[PDB]
Scaffold this active site. Sequence first.
Site: not given
Ligand SMILES: *C(=O)c1c(COP(=O)(O)O)cnc(C)c1O
Ligand SMILES: CC(=O)N[C@@H]1O[C@H](CO)[C@@H](O)[C@H](O)[C@H]1O
Lengths: 794, 794
Positions: A340, A531-532, A537, A639, A643
Amino acid sequence: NVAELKKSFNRHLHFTLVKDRNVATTRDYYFALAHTVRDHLVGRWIRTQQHYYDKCPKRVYYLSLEFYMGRTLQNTMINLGLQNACDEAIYQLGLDIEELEEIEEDAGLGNGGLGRLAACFLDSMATLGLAAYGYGIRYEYGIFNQKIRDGWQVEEADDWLRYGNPWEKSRPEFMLPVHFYGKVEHTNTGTKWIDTQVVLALPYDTPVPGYMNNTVNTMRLWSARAPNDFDYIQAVLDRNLAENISRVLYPNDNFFEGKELRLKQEYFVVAATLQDIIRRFKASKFTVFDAFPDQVAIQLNDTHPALAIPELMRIFVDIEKLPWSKAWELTQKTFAYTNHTVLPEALERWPVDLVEKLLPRHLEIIYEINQKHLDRIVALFPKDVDRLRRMSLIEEEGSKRINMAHLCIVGSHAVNGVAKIHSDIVKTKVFKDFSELEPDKFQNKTNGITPRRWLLLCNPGLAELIAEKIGEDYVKDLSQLTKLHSFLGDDVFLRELAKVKQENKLKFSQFLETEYKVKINPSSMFDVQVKRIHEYKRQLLNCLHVITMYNRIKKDPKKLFVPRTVIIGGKAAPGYHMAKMIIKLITSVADVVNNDPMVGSKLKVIFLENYRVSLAEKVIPATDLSEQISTAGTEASGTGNMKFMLNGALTIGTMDGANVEMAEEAGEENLFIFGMRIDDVAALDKKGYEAKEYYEALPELKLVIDQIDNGFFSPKQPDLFKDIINMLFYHDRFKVFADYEAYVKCQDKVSQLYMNPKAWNTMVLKNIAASGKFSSDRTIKEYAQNIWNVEPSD
Amino acid sequence: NVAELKKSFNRHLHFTLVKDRNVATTRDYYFALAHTVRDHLVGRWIRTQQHYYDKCPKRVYYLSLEFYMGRTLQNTMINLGLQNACDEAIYQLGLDIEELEEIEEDAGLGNGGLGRLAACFLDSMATLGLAAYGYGIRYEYGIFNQKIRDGWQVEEADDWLRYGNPWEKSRPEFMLPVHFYGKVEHTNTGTKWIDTQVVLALPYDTPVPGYMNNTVNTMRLWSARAPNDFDYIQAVLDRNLAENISRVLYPNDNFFEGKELRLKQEYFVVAATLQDIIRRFKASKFTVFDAFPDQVAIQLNDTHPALAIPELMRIFVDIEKLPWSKAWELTQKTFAYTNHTVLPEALERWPVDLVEKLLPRHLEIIYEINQKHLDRIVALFPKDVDRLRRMSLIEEEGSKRINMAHLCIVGSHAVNGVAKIHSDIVKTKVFKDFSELEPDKFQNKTNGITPRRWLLLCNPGLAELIAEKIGEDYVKDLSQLTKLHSFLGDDVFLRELAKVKQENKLKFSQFLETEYKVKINPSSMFDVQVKRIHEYKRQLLNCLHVITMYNRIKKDPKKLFVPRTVIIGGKAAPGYHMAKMIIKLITSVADVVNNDPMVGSKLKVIFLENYRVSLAEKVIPATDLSEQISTAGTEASGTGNMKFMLNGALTIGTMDGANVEMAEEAGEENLFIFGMRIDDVAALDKKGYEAKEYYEALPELKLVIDQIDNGFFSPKQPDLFKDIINMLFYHDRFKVFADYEAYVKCQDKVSQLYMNPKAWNTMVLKNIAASGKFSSDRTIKEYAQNIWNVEPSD
Ligand SMILES: *C(=O)c1c(COP(=O)(O)O)cnc(C)c1O
Ligand SMILES: CC(=O)N[C@@H]1O[C@H](CO)[C@@H](O)[C@H](O)[C@H]1O
Ligand SMILES: O=C(O)c1ccccc1-n1cc(C(=O)O)c(=O)c2cc(Nc3c(F)cc(F)cc3Cl)c(Cl)cc21
Ligand SMILES: O=C(O)c1ccccc1-n1cc(C(=O)O)c(=O)c2cc(Nc3c(F)cc(F)cc3Cl)c(Cl)cc21
Ligand SMILES: *C(=O)c1c(COP(=O)(O)O)cnc(C)c1O
Ligand SMILES: CC(=O)N[C@@H]1O[C@H](CO)[C@@H](O)[C@H](O)[C@H]1O
């Protein structure tokens, strides 16, 4: 039956909480209903494990350092078909169901997308009826609660178990010892691992209910305890050091911190889990081990559990005395590996010396694996000197580190990435040396999300509208969303969809304003990046646009502006300096924009504190525009992007990760694509990134930078953002300025579509009707048929 | 009802354990029964808390660092009247209740008598229907499990909560903060204690069911938890520092170790407890605080919770804003103090430096208490300088110390010892300066034991026998055992009584054969000394008699010898070296004796490992002869002595502690009293005790001693017992050699009477029939009427 749910709820309040209605707290009521709901899945939970025992289907084991579960109560009521009836029971008792539900803590045992993918996967595997178990660690403390103090991120321990967890059951009978340190002895009877320290692993089980079928699977998470046994008082207190192993989740997203405690977490979950799996295989109805890989598939969720590979060999060879060749073949047939990661600071590369100290037998096994592997590469390419070191599991300059991703490649029969673009890079670029040697090994499985949590639960408004127009079939087969195409005419339907969105935005505005002082314009476009916090990002880029927008309102107070509420939220890793400055910047910008009466209701900026699963459930359905703006080639998949697509937002973003695949599905013109594709990043790299130029060349950017560098946004501290400017100008691996212009033009296109309700909502409709492919159910069928070799059932 | 208990058990097996009969473990069954049984007291538990609120009787608070509860299941079935129905249900399910009972971990949250006295008290207060609460610390680890390896005590962590505890309920709504460190500011709005560290105290309730009535009272035990507003990982681990406060029980029986962690435990339990008492008072039907001492009594169990006195003053003064003189008056009327302590090294004397750093405001308050106290003394005794120094709460030498007893004396309205002879000396010698001033303050309350756990529970045979003769009223009024007097010439009843003892011995013998590999003579006298190991208790002396018996046998294998099983048991404080050496001596002697082929079934010696409450319950009913042989003046009361008397053992011991009152009640000739009395011990100290003269004057002793010292009992290390020998000859505070003669003679008389069953059992019957005084119901009546001013209800 409502009446039996009320009776159950009352029995539990009395016998389990020892309370009556006069002194019960909301928490008492929450626990009473959770026990009542849990009781309803017990019959299926028992039957499900009985079934797997009786029929022996091949079993899938999802091995992960992270499970970002969020809250269980509502998700369980819906999957059991009990929400209506529970809602109704609680209402008749005179209680407020929302209030009961808000009391529950998030099980926040992951960082972001990796952790949350594991959770969607469990929901899906159980819904599809597969014999799946998730294995992870029962952290006493999940991802920290984030508060904002003086505009800076501050961390609080997330004490989620303080008051108890009605959703887990300890399984004392399955307690196992795990071994650490010691030393290797090579003797007459073979190679022995001796003088070790022992730590106990006590598993706890949470039920994972399938959607509207008879399946309840198990999530088994391990908790660390001091052995039993062994200044006396000090020696009792030092039992703490053994329990420290499962104390707290490491809060890094896409970054590798090579700490010893973390390596202990990784061995811990891998050693307990493999022992348990072998115990289950042996108690089953199945050279006693020949049938192991036909009964067992273990999926390696990134490199974190990579140690499973040499641990399985240790067990096969040192304990079960199988020959090396036979053990290696069974090992490979058992494991599959999901990459990933993408980014070089995110790769696990453990110091040989640390491993030797902690796990000296596993080092020998790793060296031994690397020898055979290399011997075979020498034989095939006799004087390719450099191929040997590109392919060695050991990395040799200076320190000496084990490359865990190579360990996972050689020890698995399938390596997959997480979106077409990512899997392609992994395959033809990053592990080019490895896939030429066996191309059939590398695959793609595009990520997905579960439409239970991420549609039915978070957005009942939208779920019902869809069900009114097309049936409830879409819940088990998301591809049926394509039927909403036949409403491309319907202005009535198009007003119904805007109506759902509206309510979600009102609901979420009640929330926002009780917590932030700020006044929300209800008619503004909700523009959201959650997102984080990471440079890749590019929350920064979003922030440069926010300022760009402010600088435009000031110079033309009278000109037409499509109002926005700009929401940006997420946690920064505690040691991540740049991410914390980026947060400070956003909150500094917010302060200025928000109190300026010149701008007033045109534009509001909110930093969303403590972004986590149960909050995403609130903010996603309220979103108009989803920001997915990572630099091309950096987001393996994403992901969040899925959503939002499923919840009626439009997307602005780059051709990166699964954004590419969403464009393929909706039609590229139904999303707001912009910026460098991955080739342009390659070209710009090669020619060299000179950030200073875009700053000279672009009037609107320059202003924005001048303000930041000079104290516009930090008057009391004018040099506050020095390290940011610094990085943007001389050290930006993610080429923010390079995408600034295409990004601001793209946003203008977004702003003008929004003024046209019928056309906006026409595009929203094509996004929702196209989101089917993104169900984790589709993802899981693919893994099942092409990696695990198992079949969905009921 | 039998059928219904089976349904309940099966429901919990299914919904609480998630099991069926195919994979249920013994622990699953234990847990299912525990919950079925808890469900039966839940209604009275709710109702009795409601009752106290509605009627506000004066409430009794028993505040103790120790509660030595043992197991809960059996005691609860008995006090609820369910034991027979549960034996029947469990049996009909094909299980064995006694095996389920063995799964339960003791709540070993005490050291010995002081701790067991708190437990017996809670049982008695519930049964008498007083509105009483126990308050303590929920130690994560109780008194250690004792292993014997290779003749030596080794300690293992007593991890009693590992698997969960079905008898406790966490009470989040009553969580309280507790403050430490910081500093004091005397401002114009009152004194402020500020910059403190906070630790949360989370209370857990356990039910305390009365015997056959409607009362279930509460045992509330506090747990330490770090607060949630606080390197990130290291800071999360460091939360362990706060939680260490309730981690582990300090395991010193009768010895002061001035450890800081211990001072913290003491303040912890006292601060949480007082807050909780004050919140209850304020939420109840009643400044305002003038009714406090009429609604609240707080009994201090030794000086461990002495801090309660300045802390109650701190709350009244700094927080409720009462004037000093009013607060002090209410304080004296609220507290009473029980003194259980004799040996100088056991007196709590905390360094002023340590108290200044940890508790700066309690120091000021204690200095103020001392000041106001010493003024009244300058006034009554104008030229008595040395008396001021004697009565001061501050001991003023090199290291300045707070004398916690003096603090308890002046802050309390009543001060009691725990047996006639002890209370006497406490009053006339140890605290005569205080009692001269306040004769009515100083009282006696002779200790007692509950006949529920210590007869109905541990000895169903004897309890049935007695009920069959005189009905069941004795259980709640143990004085009614005097009716057993009228059966002294009743041959069939005497035989019945021996048959009950016989059964107890067989059941106990099986336990000894299965644990120790040692053949037990079923007709031997069981001669038993079980208590914490301490020099004053003189396990050594016993051990000298054992070696003596061995020699008499060796010298004369044809002479008739009344056969014994000698059982010695008890735990040694971990850093008590002499205690540890004495264990090794005992087990060494046993090795020789049990294996000498010339001895065979004449004499077996067992070191009973892991002596604790639930093992007391096995061994006491099986005892013929109870050893209570501490040096006159060292045992405050004793309570074990009482347990054997009630259970049909004869006693050999000294005129000490409650032995004296046992003799008054039963008649001195019905006990085997011997050795120096308290006046004899004074006289020998004044003369100077030379141990040399007994070793030379008594050839039987001289042999014993020579053997120990020359390596007779330790061949591989002739020198092993050096330290014991050196102590015996030059540093024996407890005069082992000086009571040897009298003690050996006295043993000879027991052997004689043992050979005559009809004479032995007649004496047994006079003991049992006189044991009525020693019910903790009697003791609690006396505290209720003379100290707490509360009345027994139903
Ligand atoms: C949902 O996937 C989700 C994320 C991941 O988001 P990104 O794919 O980095 O945009 C991170 N934190 C929470 C709480 C989620 O539901
Ligand atoms: C190391 C890590 O957190 N990987 C994360 O994995 C998620 C689920 O595969 C991917 O959507 C995302 O791009 C990637 O940043
Ligand atoms: O135990 C066996 O070996 C077994 C034998 C026959 C059929 C099923 C079995 N089984 C296996 C398990 C495993 O391999 O991990 C189980 O966890 C398991 C659990 C349960 N019950 C249960 C439980 F006790 C707690 C909980 F949190 C959730 C569940 Cl489902 C049951 Cl009736 C059987 C189980
Ligand atoms: O709580 C109140 O405010 C209250 C109000 C009116 C009447 C009684 C009250 N009450 C007071 C307590 C206290 O002061 O500590 C209680 O602990 C308490 C406990 C309970 N129930 C119960 C419980 F919830 C858990 C458990 F482990 C054991 C019990 Cl007995 C109840 Cl119904 C009322 C209580
Ligand atoms: C019995 O009360 C008891 C004691 C106290 O016995 P002594 O009065 O010191 O002889 C210590 N430990 C346990 C487990 C007891 O039940
Ligand atoms: C400090 C301590 O443990 N004191 C003990 O208290 C119990 C209960 O009062 C007495 O029976 C015993 O003789 C005395 O040793």
